[PDB]
Design an enzyme around this catalytic site. Structure first.
Site, short mmCIF file in Angstrom:
data_model
loop_
_atom_site.label_atom_id
_atom_site.label_comp_id
_atom_site.label_asym_id
_atom_site.label_seq_id
_atom_site.Cartn_x
_atom_site.Cartn_y
_atom_site.Cartn_z
CG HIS A 141 -0.58 0.53 2.44
ND1 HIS A 141 -0.31 -0.29 3.51
CD2 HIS A 141 -0.39 1.80 2.88
CE1 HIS A 141 0.01 0.44 4.56
NE2 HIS A 141 -0.03 1.72 4.20
CG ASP A 196 -0.34 -3.60 2.99
OD1 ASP A 196 0.35 -3.24 2.00
OD2 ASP A 196 -0.77 -2.80 3.84
N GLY A 201 2.59 6.30 8.90
CA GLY A 201 4.02 6.51 8.73
C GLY A 201 4.83 5.28 9.13
#
Ligand SMILES: C[C@H](NC(=O)[C@@H](CO)NS(=O)(=O)Cc1ccccc1)C(=O)NCc1ccc(C(=N)N)cc1
Length: 247
Positions: free
Chosen positions: A46, A97, A196
């Site tokens: 992602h 992912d 983050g």
């Protein structure tokens, strides 16, 4: 990382800082990653799905600070950007992912081991730590939900693995979490990964050995009660990792 402590790359030698180049000269932080072999860094799909252009990425190993140089750090270009073909994002869940980045210095070399640059061991086929086991996460992610900037210093914290059963409860994530995912959180809901921190490692001490158990993927908010961080279950992706790291 919400809460936790500031650390140094010497304590997380396998941590990779991934950045993206822009039109002009600006270099912004994208995601974290882990060095699983001299030439390969593993992260999350992602992070790159909207910009699959390998040339725009820079991978830093041996780096403790976000926007400043660290002694012994090494810069790498992305030779190959491998995203998982079956990736998809639902309302909350991010499926498959996981991503691989083949790195290479300008001289054409892979990473050189040092006190600040080391690989992290991969798990064995379907061999995960018992639920309730403490594991660590690292990243340059938000320290608070309301922040719009990332911390300059690398951070780390400890969270506990949660059973698939507990994580699949109605007030948790229900059927959105699958067996290809791992839930982990602080029993007091005080510390957790956040925006983050994606792509970074969830490291667990498995049989007296540091293992890359998970990859920071998703979660509702950050450090929200009954909303654990969800990680890509690395042990379920070994066949995929092997097949894409040969030649
Ligand atoms: C790509 C991914 N998207 C999401 O997680 C989406 C649902 O897919 N949920 S969210 O609630 O919007 C994530 C978030 C959290 C806080 C503020 C804004 C975004 C993302 O942001 N990934 C980073 C992330 C990783 C872990 C956690 C956590 N441990 N709570 C939270 C966020």
């Amino acid at each position: 990382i919400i809460g936790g402590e500031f650390t140094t790359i010497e304590n997380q030698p396998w941590f990779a800082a991934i950045y993206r180049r822009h039109r002009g000269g600006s270099v912004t932080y994208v995601c974290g990653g882990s060095l699983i072999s001299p030439c390969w860094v593993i992260s999350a799909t992602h992070c790159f799905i909207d910009y699959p252009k390998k040339e725009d990425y820079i991978v830093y190993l041996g780096r403790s600070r976000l926007n400043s140089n660290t002694q012994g750090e090494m810069k790498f270009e992305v030779e190959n950007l491998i995203l998982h073909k079956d990736y998809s994002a639902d309302t909350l869940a991010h499926h498959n992912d996981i991503a691989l980045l083949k790195i290479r210095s300008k001289e054409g070399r892979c990473a050189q081991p040092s006190r600040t640059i080391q690989t992290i061991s991969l798990p064995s086929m379907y061999n995960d730590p018992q639920f309730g086991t403490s594991c660590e996460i690292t990243g340059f992610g938000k320290e608070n939900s309301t922040d719009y900037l990332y911390p300059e210093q690398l951070k780390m914290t400890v969270v506990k693995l949660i059973s698939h059963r507990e994580c699949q409860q109605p007030h948790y994530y229900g059927s959105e979490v699958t067996t290809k995912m791992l839930c982990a959180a602080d029993p007091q809901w005080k510390t957790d990964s956040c925006q983050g921190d994606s792509g970074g490692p969830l490291v667990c001490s498995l049989q007296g050995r540091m293992t890359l158990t998970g990859i920071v993927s998703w979660g509702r908010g950050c450090a929200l009660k009954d909303k654990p961080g969800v990680y890509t279950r690395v042990s379920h992706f070994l066949p995929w990792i092997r097949s894409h790291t040969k030649e």
